[PDB]
Design an enzyme around this catalytic site. Structure first.
Site, PDB file in Angstrom:
ATOM      1  N   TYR A  20      -8.809   0.858   3.643  1.00  0.00           N
ATOM      2  CA  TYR A  20      -7.950   0.089   2.821  1.00  0.00           C
ATOM      3  C   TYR A  20      -8.591  -1.179   2.393  1.00  0.00           C
ATOM      4  O   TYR A  20      -8.023  -1.861   1.556  1.00  0.00           O
ATOM      5  CB  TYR A  20      -6.651  -0.316   3.639  1.00  0.00           C
ATOM      6  CG  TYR A  20      -5.776   0.861   3.929  1.00  0.00           C
ATOM      7  CD1 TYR A  20      -4.827   1.275   3.055  1.00  0.00           C
ATOM      8  CD2 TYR A  20      -5.841   1.438   5.145  1.00  0.00           C
ATOM      9  CE1 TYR A  20      -4.000   2.336   3.345  1.00  0.00           C
ATOM     10  CE2 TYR A  20      -5.030   2.487   5.462  1.00  0.00           C
ATOM     11  CZ  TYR A  20      -4.123   2.927   4.559  1.00  0.00           C
ATOM     12  OH  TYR A  20      -3.313   3.999   4.942  1.00  0.00           O
ATOM     13  N   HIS A  25      -3.878  -3.774  -2.537  1.00  0.00           N
ATOM     14  CA  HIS A  25      -2.889  -4.287  -1.561  1.00  0.00           C
ATOM     15  C   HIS A  25      -3.503  -5.144  -0.524  1.00  0.00           C
ATOM     16  O   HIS A  25      -2.773  -5.811   0.220  1.00  0.00           O
ATOM     17  CB  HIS A  25      -2.147  -3.123  -0.952  1.00  0.00           C
ATOM     18  CG  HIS A  25      -0.664  -3.281  -0.739  1.00  0.00           C
ATOM     19  ND1 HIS A  25       0.164  -4.092  -1.462  1.00  0.00           N
ATOM     20  CD2 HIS A  25       0.121  -2.627   0.150  1.00  0.00           C
ATOM     21  CE1 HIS A  25       1.402  -3.970  -1.013  1.00  0.00           C
ATOM     22  NE2 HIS A  25       1.405  -3.071  -0.046  1.00  0.00           N
ATOM     23  N   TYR A  71      -0.443  -3.125   9.836  1.00  0.00           N
ATOM     24  CA  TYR A  71      -0.099  -2.422   8.573  1.00  0.00           C
ATOM     25  C   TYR A  71       0.876  -3.213   7.751  1.00  0.00           C
ATOM     26  O   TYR A  71       1.691  -3.961   8.298  1.00  0.00           O
ATOM     27  CB  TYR A  71       0.402  -0.939   8.740  1.00  0.00           C
ATOM     28  CG  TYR A  71      -0.742  -0.053   9.186  1.00  0.00           C
ATOM     29  CD1 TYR A  71      -1.717   0.428   8.296  1.00  0.00           C
ATOM     30  CD2 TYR A  71      -1.025   0.072  10.528  1.00  0.00           C
ATOM     31  CE1 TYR A  71      -2.825   1.213   8.731  1.00  0.00           C
ATOM     32  CE2 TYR A  71      -2.111   0.867  10.980  1.00  0.00           C
ATOM     33  CZ  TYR A  71      -3.000   1.414  10.082  1.00  0.00           C
ATOM     34  OH  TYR A  71      -4.114   2.104  10.564  1.00  0.00           O
ATOM     35  N   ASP A  98      -1.094  -9.658  -2.967  1.00  0.00           N
ATOM     36  CA  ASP A  98      -1.125  -9.025  -4.280  1.00  0.00           C
ATOM     37  C   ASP A  98       0.209  -9.083  -4.976  1.00  0.00           C
ATOM     38  O   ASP A  98       1.267  -8.918  -4.326  1.00  0.00           O
ATOM     39  CB  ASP A  98      -1.560  -7.552  -4.118  1.00  0.00           C
ATOM     40  CG  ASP A  98      -0.709  -6.782  -3.117  1.00  0.00           C
ATOM     41  OD1 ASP A  98      -0.580  -7.196  -1.931  1.00  0.00           O
ATOM     42  OD2 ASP A  98      -0.214  -5.645  -3.474  1.00  0.00           O
TER      43      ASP A  98
END
Length: 196
Positions: A20, A25, A71, A98
């Site tokens: 990620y 994000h 997360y 974001d």
């Protein structure tokens, strides 16, 4: 504890994992990692607060940095106890994240307001309320209501990444104003940013 609207905790939202790291994000992680390197603040494992954190001097002020490792949709499980333990009021917190409602290369400093659909912010505002500051890093919108997941968990094309990286570099140069409590001027100078 914190003092007035001198920013003393800077949080960057994102997800853990190399899978990620380059996704939209994680824009907040990019900003806090870059700010940490700029000021020589060590980000170290912080299991107690389910995150990676650091503390260091920014322009003569003692500032803490936090990346939750929960997360994104569980970010409050790091931000809330961390800010409570250190007695940091929301008024002294900056959360970089974001922002789907702004184009890549647009960056704005906001105080207050809702989560605007951001699932990280959605996990924080219920606990500490809305009166923290936000560095909203435009990531652009997807082509519909249902491409949102795919867009925020995507890696932006290079043009968009260049626009976001220039906006993020600009904002780094304004953190001095924020840690000095010059929020109105920092809002003026951040929101005025243009890429080209």
């Amino acid at each position: 504890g914190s003092h007035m609207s001198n920013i003393s905790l800077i949080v960057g939202l994102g997800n853990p994992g190399s899978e990620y790291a380059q996704t939209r994000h994680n824009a907040g992680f990019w900003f806090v990692e870059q700010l940490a390197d700029k000021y020589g603040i060590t980000l170290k494992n912080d299991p107690k607060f389910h995150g990676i954190s650091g503390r260091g001097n920014i322009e003569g002020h003692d500032v803490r940095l936090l990346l939750p490792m929960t997360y994104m949709n569980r970010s409050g499980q790091s931000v809330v106890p961390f800010s409570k333990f250190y007695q940091i009021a929301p008024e002294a917190i900056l959360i970089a994240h974001d922002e789907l409602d702004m184009n890549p290369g647009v960056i704005r400093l906001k105080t207050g307001g809702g989560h605007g659909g951001h699932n990280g912010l959605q996990d924080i505002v219920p606990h500490i309320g809305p009166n923290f500051h936000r560095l909203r890093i435009g990531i652009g919108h997807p082509g519909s209501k249902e491409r949102v997941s795919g867009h925020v968990l995507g890696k932006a094309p290079s043009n968009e990444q260049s626009l976001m990286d220039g906006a993020i570099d600009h904002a780094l140069s304004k953190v001095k104003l924020l840690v000095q409590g010059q929020v109105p001027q920092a809002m003026n100078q951040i929101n005025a940013y243009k890429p080209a």
